[PDB]
Design a protein around this ligand. Structure first.
Ligand SMILES: OC[C@H]1NC[C@H](O)[C@@H](O)[C@H]1O
Length: 848
């Protein structure tokens, strides 16, 4: 009866983007916010998402302290009015918020729909009953509160992720109603794979209805791989719900994996019939993958043994603040992928829809984390105070606490995403010590998950294993998990592995090395928690700085590499984030406001350890590379004195995955050096330099201005890669570098344009801190500027006079430009005092 074209249209119309045409006002009058025909002339008209804190100036007296990035919170209201189309009058209406930070209240036409404490977990409300008859307009009012301190990192404030509207028939697939399982995949993979699908269907009508479900699987952006599979027609009574199911068979599916960068994804199409009429249709993304994990060998995915080469990530995007954005998150996860990362940990909260989708699309395994605390709390205004309180969500189950409800809904939201393979039910929970309360809580939380989903490893990240020999009552908590996460506990691994030979162990959080891009200090030393005044609020890009409880990249990686029973690690952190500026943590009269832990700075510019990791994790066949550090501008006595050795030479180091690297200074060879080849005690091959603690090759080079060039060669002496560093003259010009020639004209897509301070020959001046002023013309919108410098107190956003400015830091920074909905172009022009100006143009229009 109904066309495939029509079913796709129904699917498309089922969900709309609801981000547009909101009004915002900080400290607005409650009664004014929720009331109809209110005076919004005093409010800011905007499109969501919108993190209000990122527009503040830094405040040394912020109750957030520097750990929260010294950007204030407070309270505010967002307000939207909308009319249902005539044809949608009797339809079910659901409003989904991907994240609101935090402690929120939603009002529809004057009445309180729900109060939702969690600042990161997605929540939705059926608002059908709160709507007007006959189609007069409705008022959505959202109140968001960030009372500080509520966070150990920058949170942002408000509606920082998308909001979506679902308009469905009275008879429909409930929110998160789809379950897709492939329980015999390993066995069936070379033939027909049984795909067990389940739909929770609800009948919100007051009449009884006859119900049939019809399923089909298709390749995402590909063709159908099944026909239609029908369920038996059964009665669904008024105000009742039921689970339908079916088995579909897919022949030799392409298996989702981290081992390529465009893994195979599938979608289940669900068609719902109400008395033989197609009334509801839906798609659900999933993949075919299987995995196994043993105590002594670690992890394997579709039968291929791998290690988690992983990073921890906070949610902010530097100059974007907490505003989640598809392009921003894609950019960052693609960068992680380019580094050889195959796994992410969403530290320490539920992820956005963007993150989860992009992980599935790029082939990144995900640990999704529910809690940074249990009933104890870490910060006065964090989640702890809500953990054991009864959930008041209208769809909460009897006896559900917020912890129960929030854990359950997170798992229901993500149970079909192929990228997720671990659920974490806590990071460094101090209360989880093995006492009767904590033991009862771990079992309860494990079971909440298991009642939804048994296919993924339940875990926690625990730093308790680093104290003494690692033992204690917390071992009783670990015994209840599928896999035991070790925060910074490498030193006790041997002993703990001997004690618990059945544990699946990995590094849930490692390193916490601290680094500032382009800054260098005492390369000959390892520096522990070095935060003296002589450091000038910077840390060393040689990667020789680490916090008291931390390890260098080399120390934390070599240990992982050498032990098969330690399945991998999630480095703290993959990128910098606003807040937590250890080792100047909560020294609030100091200038620092953002992190040093990132492999990549907040502006998306990699620090040198990026290439260290790339050299270890990306095969010489996939991407031959060689990367040199430090810079070659040593004219400054102060800078050079901190770096030069006792003979005044500069330690020049190369990371490479090649067999050999030869360093040249101004055309003249300083020697070919060869990586030592070694094997792990279980027969895996690896390369190192002069000793076990050096993954680079080093030359002590006496300082002559000019050019360092490194030639990387395969075993047969064939050149496979080059890298070059040139001494720069004095600043002469600002140069702009486009990442994109064009982006989509959807008002959502954006582009990153780097600016560099260059000398007259076009070399980057690696020490340059020049102020740059920006002009934008055409069909675009500036939405951020950044240089990643931790000690900077510069605005990420427009100045109070509407201007856009930012200093270079160590030669570089970035400007971020969002598209509009009009096709055309925009031109970014950059100016700096007494330097040559430059412009670039980026086109906008059609999406790929
Ligand atoms: O080393 C910093 C790191 N410590 C461990 C915590 O889990 C992280 O959020 C962060 O605070």
């Amino acid at each position: 009866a109904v066309t495939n074209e029509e079913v796709n249209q129904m699917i498309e119309d089922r969900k709309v983007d609801f981000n547009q045409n909101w009004y915002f006002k900080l400290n607005a009058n409650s009664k004014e916010a929720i009331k109809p025909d209110a005076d919004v002339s005093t409010w800011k008209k905007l499109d969501l998402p919108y993190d209000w804190s990122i527009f503040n100036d830094f405040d040394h007296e912020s109750p957030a302290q520097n750990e929260g990035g010294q950007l204030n919170g407070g309270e505010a209201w967002y307000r939207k009015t909308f009319k249902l189309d005539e044809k949608d009058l009797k339809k079910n209406v659901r409003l989904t918020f991907d994240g609101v930070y935090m402690d929120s209240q939603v009002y529809v036409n004057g009445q309180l729909v729900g109060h939702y404490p969690n600042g990161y977990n997605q929540f939705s409300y059926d608002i059908t009953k709160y709507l007007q008859k006959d189609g007069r307009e409705n008022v959505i009012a959202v109140h968001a509160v960030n009372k500080q301190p509520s966070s150990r990192w920058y949170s942002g404030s408000g509606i920082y992720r998308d909001v979506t509207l679902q308009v469905t028939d009275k008879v429909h697939v409930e929110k998160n109603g789809t379950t897709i399982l492939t329980p015999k995949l390993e066995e069936q993979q070379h033939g027909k794979v049984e795909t067990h699908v389940t739909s929770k269907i609800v009948n919100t009508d007051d009449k009884d209805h006859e119900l049939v479900a019809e399923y089909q699987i298709v390749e995402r952006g590909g063709h159908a791989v099944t026909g239609l599979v029908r369920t038996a027609s059964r009665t669904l009574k008024a105000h009742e719900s039921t689970s339908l199911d079916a088995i579909l068979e897919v022949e030799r599916p392409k298996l989702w994996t981290v081992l390529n960068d465009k893994p195979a994804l599938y979608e289940l199409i669900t068609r719902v019939y109400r008395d033989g009429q197609l009334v509801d249709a839906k798609k659900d993304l999933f993949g075919y993958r299987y995995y196994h994990w043993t105590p002594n060998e670690g992890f394997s995915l579709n039968g291929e043994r791998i290690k988690f080469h992983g990073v921890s990530l906070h949610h902010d995007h530097g100059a974007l603040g907490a505003e989640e954005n598809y392009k921003a998150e894609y950019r960052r996860l693609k960068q992680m992928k380019e580094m050889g990362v195959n796994s992410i940990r969403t530290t320490h909260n539920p992820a956005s829809e963007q993150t989860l989708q992009i992980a599935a699309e790029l082939g990144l395994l995900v640990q999704e984390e529910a809690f940074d605390t249990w009933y104890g709390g870490k910060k006065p205004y964090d989640y702890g105070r809500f953990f054991e309180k009864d959930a008041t969500h209208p769809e909460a189950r009897k006896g559900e606490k917020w912890s129960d409800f929030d854990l359950r809904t997170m798992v229901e939201r993500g149970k079909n995403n192929p990228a997720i393979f671990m659920w974490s039910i806590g990071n460094e929970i101090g209360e989880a010590n093995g006492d009767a309360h904590s033991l009862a809580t771990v079992k309860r939380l494990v079971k909440v998950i298991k009642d939804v989903d048994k296919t993924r490893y339940v875990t926690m990240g625990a730093d308790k294993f680093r104290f003494g020999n690692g033992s204690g009552g917390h071992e009783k908590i670990a015994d209840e998990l599928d896999a035991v996460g070790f925060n910074y506990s490498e030193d006790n691994y041997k002993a703990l592995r001997a004690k618990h030979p059945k544990w699946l162990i990995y590094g849930s959080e490692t390193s916490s090395a601290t680094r500032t891009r382009g800054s260098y200090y005492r390369p000959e030393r390892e520096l522990k928690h070095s935060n003296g005044p002589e450091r000038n609020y910077e840390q060393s890009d040689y990667g020789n700085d680490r916090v008291g409880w931390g390890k260098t990249a080399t120390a934390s990686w070599t240990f992982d590499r050498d032990n098969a029973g330690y399945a991998g690690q999630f480095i703290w952190t993959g990128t910098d984030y606003i807040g937590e500026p250890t080792p100047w943590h909560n020294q609030n009269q100091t200038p620092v406001k953002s992190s040093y832990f990132g492999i990549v700075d907040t502006a998306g510019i990699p620090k040198h350890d990026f290439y260290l990791y790339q050299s270890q994790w990306v095969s010489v066949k996939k991407k031959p590379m060689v990367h040199l550090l430090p810079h070659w501008n040593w004219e400054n006595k102060e800078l050079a004195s901190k770096v030069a050795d006792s003979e005044g030479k500069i330690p020049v180091r190369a990371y490479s995955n090649a067999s050999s690297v030869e360093l040249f200074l101004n055309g003249k060879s300083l020697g070919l050096k060869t990586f030592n080849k070694k094997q792990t005690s279980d027969g895996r091959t690896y390369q190192e330099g002069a000793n076990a603690n050096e993954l680079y090759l080093e030359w002590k080079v006496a300082y002559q201005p000019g050019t360092l060039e490194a030639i990387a060669r395969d075993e047969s002496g064939k050149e496979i890669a080059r890298d070059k560093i040139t001494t720069a003259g004095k600043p002469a010009a600002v140069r702009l570098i486009k990442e994109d020639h064009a982006i989509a004209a959807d008002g959502k897509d954006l582009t990153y344009i780097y600016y560099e301070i260059v000398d007259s020959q076009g070399n980057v001046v690696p020490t340059a801190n020049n102020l740059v002023r920006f002009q934008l013309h055409g069909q675009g919108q500036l939405v951020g500027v950044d240089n990643g410098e931790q000690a900077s107190r510069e605005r990420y956003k427009a100045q109070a006079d509407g201007s856009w400015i930012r200093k270079a830091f160590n030669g570089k920074g970035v400007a971020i430009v969002k598209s509009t909905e009009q096709a055309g172009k925009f031109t970014l022009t950059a100016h700096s005092d007494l330097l040559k100006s430059n412009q670039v143009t980026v086109f906008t229009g059609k999406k790929e």
